[PDB]
RNA sequence: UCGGAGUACAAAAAACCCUCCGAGUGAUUUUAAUCUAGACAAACCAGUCAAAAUAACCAUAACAUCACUUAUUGAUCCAAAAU
């Protein structure tokens, strides 16, 4: 019982350290879609 | 403590919400009635430099007012 | 436990030694207008803007529009400054506004507001209205040139179309006339959308009418793609905003993919996306105008929907949230009588057994 | 200086009355009070003394 | 409402211009009851409801009016509304 | 809240003199 | 059946002026130990500095909607000065005829107790009563 | 119940009903003593009737 | 509380009880707030009305008075024209 | 018996034949309504606030005020008065 207690543990921790990974990442691409989805700002650059 | 958004005041100065929602903790500045003289007379002494600041109950409204329904289609 | 403020703290600025030196306020106008001033900066504690849907604070506005007109602030600075002395010498204008009797052309303030700070006050307008949410998202256009939308109701009436003004779909049962100032060596387009009204998506808007490759100024002239279709609110829900979009494009763009058909009366035919329709054409068209006017429902509307639609008219409601109670307990204590009342299902009285 | 509680009758010829304490120095009071009976605002006048 | 031959035909009339928001697109007037649980009741309301429907408007002389704080508003809303419309020139 | 470090964002009564009220038994011009 | 007559059983409206329009929005009740009240849909906000004249009309978000100041070019050759009654006359008849364009046709103004025995002030709303825009918001349905 | 009476047979429409009737087919029970003066008629089952 | 008469040998009731309470047939009693007659000039206009409304009691005195009265108050009773006769039974009760 | 400050230093509560102030009502008019969501407080009895709605009156008007404002008060039964 107690060798099974650790395996449940030692598990626990590893697979909730990546589901924190997961979420950085999918942070990150989340945000560089915003980037490549907007339109092409023209504003004053259409002068410049 | 003095009543914000969405927050009534009693005549005993007693602070109840208005809306449903969540209670919210701020500090503002404060702008006293120009009806109050005791109040007015502070704000006038006060140097340049210094606002007063209070702090507020707010309660921020969860529920909307209210939705469409579609209830008949002639 | 006193910990360390995370900042400056606001009135430690001033000496609290030597007060009479410090000047005072001495007025109940001078406050009111510091205080303001400083109700509006992003201080480190807990404010009534962060809690209140400040919408996101400050945002990169992507700006899609034509460049500022190129004006000489240099020369601009001097024959202003010479206009207003020639204006000021006159005796006759002093002896008028001394004894207040003055008024001024709100026609000639009206043509130059326009022209100088008229596109950036329509600006805000739209911000306000949501029109650019609802539309470009994020991105927000300028409406450098102007443009002007009327309906003909009467014989020689003519109902304007201001931004955010309110018209009867009765005054807009017939097409409008668009007049803009515009010389022949580029090409126009004018769409006009029902931003809120569609029925099976939320995030969807219809589109009323849409003229295509508009020679300078003349709109009819210009290659037609949708007809026009009188606004056609709901009952229950009212004020809709139809919202008039000009576009400037440099080359004859070939806007035949969005042609629609020439009776067209089927709704899922008129399914828009603004933001997708400028994703595809984003190269060629620039938005350069704007107008829009809300829109309630009236009794023209219901022949739309009977003769034009070939549509059973749907009725709508404002229906709001049931009142809220506790649960109810057993022996409820110091309870006026009417406490059963409230978890009642229904006032008729029910038998059971008998 | 003792008070004085009186009971009012409404002029209206409504029956209605409420009591008020009155100082004993005053005269005969008279008010503008607002009967539920004919909901609107009608003359009161001072009928009887009840309690000092 | 168009057969309907026990009213007469001003009365005929002046329901359709009156309740023109209960009448169908074929022309079948619609009057629903949700007040009491027993369908006898529901239907006697109807019928009661009917029969004011029918007896102000039969009354050539019936026409009043009231004042309602939304009419306030409509009538400034209105009002506004014809300021920008008083301008008369050629029009489309 | 004394713990928080927004503590002592109400203060006011250094700003302003103690402005001692003229009492009735203590009117004096005490120059 | 009819591919046309498909509607959603709820309808959602996207306008942000769909429920102050329709009287069923919420004012913000409450404060009542500041001042002014902060109860209203739209507010009228008049500054007078000594050089120039400049009222607003402001939303419950802090945001201004439609704005008319001396300080604009186009007000500023037509009048002789802006620091006088006259000025804050065509101030309000500006921002009157602005507010018609804009659809506002209700908003609150909460006028300091001095400035409400003003001569300038007095006569500013004279100018928006006959403008067109009426004070005094309508109440609020179901408060 | 006067419904579910006569369905079983409990009573019969044929012979006039009174309250006699209704005793004999243990519809209701009437004490004179705690001041009972008889049956009141309900609407409760007025749709089904 | 005559637990056993010497007449009969039955359980008595208090005659206070029922003079001044009310049974629902649901267990709960009903009762008039004390001092509603007493000094009305004296108090607000809120206090008065709190004080002419009926209120419940709990469980402890609902308890009580079941023990000092028999069994005849707490039967059921059809009376015409009641107007707490609506009030007799509950619903909608999810305990 | 009832209220305020300290003892009880920062949510609530917290004692002594403990240390100090009070209350057992006046002045004035703005004479302060009816009905009901939801809560604070509490052994019980009591005490407090209160949106919406209706009426009153600027014709879309409810906090009586001031005196440290907080305390200025008494349950049934019973008696008297118009009810
Ligand atoms: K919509
Ligand atoms: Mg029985
Ligand atoms: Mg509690
Ligand atoms: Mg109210
Ligand atoms: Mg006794």
Redesign the interface.
Same mark, same amino acid.
């Given at each position: 019982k107690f060798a099974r207690r650790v395996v449940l543990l030692s598990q626990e921790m590893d697979a909730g350290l990546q589901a924190w990974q997961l979420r950085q990442q999918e942070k990150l691409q989340e945000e560089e879609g915003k980037q490549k989805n907007?339109?092409?700002?023209?504003?004053?650059l259409?002068?410049? | 403590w003095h009543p914000?958004?969405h927050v009534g005041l009693g005549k005993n100065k007693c602070l109840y919400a208005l809306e449903?929602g969540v209670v919210? +903790?701020?500090?503002?500045?404060?702008?006293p009635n120009?009806s109050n003289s005791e109040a007015?007379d502070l @704000?006038?002494? !006060?140097?340049?430099?210094?606002?007063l +600041?209070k702090t507020?109950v707010?309660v921020?409204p969860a529920?909307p007012?209210?939705?469409?329904?579609? @209830?008949?289609? !002639? | 436990?006193?910990?360390?403020?995370?900042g400056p703290?606001?009135?430690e600025?001033?000496d609290?030694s030597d007060?009479e030196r410090?000047?005072?306020?001495?007025?109940?106008?001078?406050?009111?207008?510091?205080?303001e001033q400083?109700?509006?900066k992003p201080?480190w504690?807990?404010?009534?803007?962060e809690?209140?849907?400040?919408?996101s604070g400050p945002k990169d506005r992507?700006?899609?529009?034509?460049?500022?007109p190129?004006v000489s602030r240099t020369q601009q600075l001097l024959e202003?400054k010479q206009?207003?002395r020639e204006?000021?010498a006159?005796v006759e204008?002093?002896r008028?506004?001394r004894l207040?009797?003055?008024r001024?052309?709100?026609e000639?303030?009206?043509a130059?507001?326009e022209r100088?700070?008229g596109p950036y006050?329509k600006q805000?307008?739209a911000?306000?209205?949501?029109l650019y949410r609802?539309l470009?998202?994020?991105?927000t256009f300028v409406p450098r040139v102007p443009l002007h939308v009327?309906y003909?109701?009467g014989e020689?009436?003519?109902?304007?179309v201001?931004?955010?003004?309110?018209?009867?779909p009765t005054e807009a049962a017939?097409?409008?006339?668009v007049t803009y100032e515009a010389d022949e060596g580029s090409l126009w387009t004018l769409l006009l959308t029902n931003?809120?009204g569609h029925?099976?998506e939320?995030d969807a808007e219809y589109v009323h009418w849409l003229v295509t490759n508009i020679p300078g100024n003349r709109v009819t002239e210009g290659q037609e793609t949708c007809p026009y279709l009188p606004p056609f609110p709901?009952?229950?829900?009212?004020?809709?905003?139809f919202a008039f979009l000009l576009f400037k494009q440099d080359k004859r763009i070939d806007f035949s993919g969005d042609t629609r058909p020439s009776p067209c009366?089927?709704?899922?035919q008129r399914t828009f996306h603004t933001f997708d329709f400028?994703?595809k054409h984003?190269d060629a068209m620039?938005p350069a105008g704007l107008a829009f006017?809300?829109c309630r429902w009236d009794?023209s509307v219901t022949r739309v929907f009977?003769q034009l639609?070939?549509?059973?008219?749907?009725?709508?409601?404002?229906?709001?949230?049931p009142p809220?109670h506790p649960?109810?307990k057993?022996?409820?204590?110091?309870?006026?009588?009417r406490?059963?009342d409230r978890?009642?299902?229904?006032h008729?009285?029910?038998?059971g057994?008998? | 200086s003792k008070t004085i509680l009186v009971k009012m009758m409404s002029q209206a010829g409504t029956g209605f009355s409420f009591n008020t304490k009155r100082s004993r120095l005053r005269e005969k009071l008279t008010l503008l009070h607002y009967d539920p009976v004919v909901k609107k605002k009608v003359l009161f006048v001072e009928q009887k003394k009840i309690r000092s | 409402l168009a057969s309907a031959d026990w009213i007469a035909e001003p009365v005929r009339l002046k329901l359709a211009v009156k309740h023109?928001?209960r009448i169908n697109?074929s022309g079948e007037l619609i009057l629903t009851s949700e007040c009491?649980?027993?369908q006898f009741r529901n239907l006697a309301d109807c019928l009661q409801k009917l029969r004011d429907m029918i007896a102000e408007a039969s009354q050539p002389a019936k026409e009043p009016s009231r004042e309602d704080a939304e009419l306030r508003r409509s009538r400034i809303?209105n009002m506004n509304?014809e300021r920008?419309?008083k301008?008369?020139?050629?029009?489309? | 809240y004394?713990?928080?470090?927004?503590?002592?964002?109400g203060?006011?009564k250094?700003?302003?003199?103690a402005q001692e009220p003229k009492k009735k038994k203590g009117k004096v011009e005490v120059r | 059946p009819?591919?046309?007559?498909?509607?959603?059983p709820e309808?959602?409206?996207?306008?942000?002026?769909?429920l102050e329009?329709?009287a069923?929005a919420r004012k913000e009740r409450g404060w009542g130990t500041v001042w002014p009240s902060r109860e209203f849909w739209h507010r009228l906000r008049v500054?007078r500095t000594q050089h120039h004249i400049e009222a607003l009309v402001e939303?419950r978000?802090?945001?201004?909607?439609?704005?008319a100041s001396t300080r604009?070019?186009?007000?500023?050759?037509?009048?002789?000065?802006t620091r006088?009654?006259?000025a804050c006359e065509?101030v309000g008849?500006?921002l009157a005829?602005?507010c018609l364009?804009?659809?506002?046709n209700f908003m609150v103004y909460h006028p300091?107790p001095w400035e409400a025995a003003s001569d300038s002030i007095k006569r500013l709303q004279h100018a928006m009563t006959e403008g067109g825009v009426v004070l005094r918001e309508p109440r609020r349905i179901?408060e | 119940?006067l419904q579910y009476l006569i369905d079983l047979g409990r009573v019969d429409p044929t012979q006039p009903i009174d309250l006699t009737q209704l005793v004999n087919g243990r519809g209701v029970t009437i004490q004179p003593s705690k001041r009972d003066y008889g049956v009141q008629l309900?609407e409760?089952g007025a749709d089904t009737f | 509380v005559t637990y056993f008469s010497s007449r009969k040998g039955k359980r008595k009731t208090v005659k206070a009880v029922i003079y001044r309470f009310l049974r629902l047939h649901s267990?709960?009693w009903?009762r008039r707030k004390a001092g509603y007659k007493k000094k009305l000039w004296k108090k607000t206009a809120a206090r008065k009305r709190r004080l002419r409304?009926?209120?419940?009691?709990?469980?402890t005195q609902?308890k009580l008075l079941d023990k000092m009265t028999t069994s005849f108050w707490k039967r059921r009773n059809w009376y015409a024209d009641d107007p707490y006769q609506?009030?007799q039974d509950?619903?909608?009760?999810?305990?």
């Open positions: 907007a339109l092409k700002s023209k504003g004053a259409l002068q410049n | 914000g958004a449903e919210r +903790y701020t500090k503002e500045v404060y702008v120009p007015v @704000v006038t002494r !006060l140097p340049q430099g210094a606002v +600041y507020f707010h921020v529920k007012e209210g939705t469409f329904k579609l @209830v008949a289609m !002639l | 436990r006193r910990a360390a403020p995370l703290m606001p009135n600025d001033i609290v007060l410090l000047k005072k306020y001495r007025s109940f106008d001078r406050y009111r207008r510091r205080a400083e109700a509006r201080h504690w807990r404010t009534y803007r809690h209140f849907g400040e919408e992507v700006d899609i529009g034509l460049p500022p190129k202003r206009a207003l204006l000021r006159n204008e002093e008028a506004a207040q009797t003055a001024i052309p709100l000639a303030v009206r130059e507001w100088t700070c006050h805000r307008l911000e306000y209205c949501g609802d470009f998202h994020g991105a009327a003909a109701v020689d009436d003519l109902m304007p201001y931004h955010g003004n309110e018209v009867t017939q097409a409008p006339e931003l809120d029925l099976l939320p709901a009952r229950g829900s009212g004020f809709h905003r009366y089927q709704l899922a400028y994703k984003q620039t006017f809300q009794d009977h639609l070939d549509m059973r008219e749907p009725v709508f409601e404002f229906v709001r949230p809220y649960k109810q057993r022996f409820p204590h110091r309870q006026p009588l406490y059963l978890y009642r299902d229904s008729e009285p029910t038998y057994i008998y | - | 023109k928001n697109r009491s649980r027993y809303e509304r920008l419309r301008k008369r020139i050629s029009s489309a | 004394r713990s928080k470090p927004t503590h002592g964002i203060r006011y250094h700003l302003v003199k | 009819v591919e046309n007559e498909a509607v959603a309808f959602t409206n996207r306008n942000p002026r769909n329009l329709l069923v500054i939303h978000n802090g945001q201004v909607v439609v704005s604009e070019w186009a007000i500023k050759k037509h009048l002789y000065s006088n009654v006259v065509s008849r500006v005829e602005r364009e804009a659809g506002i300091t179901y | 119940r309900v409760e | 267990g709960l009903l409304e009926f209120v419940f009691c709990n469980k609902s609506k009030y509950r619903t909608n009760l999810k305990v």
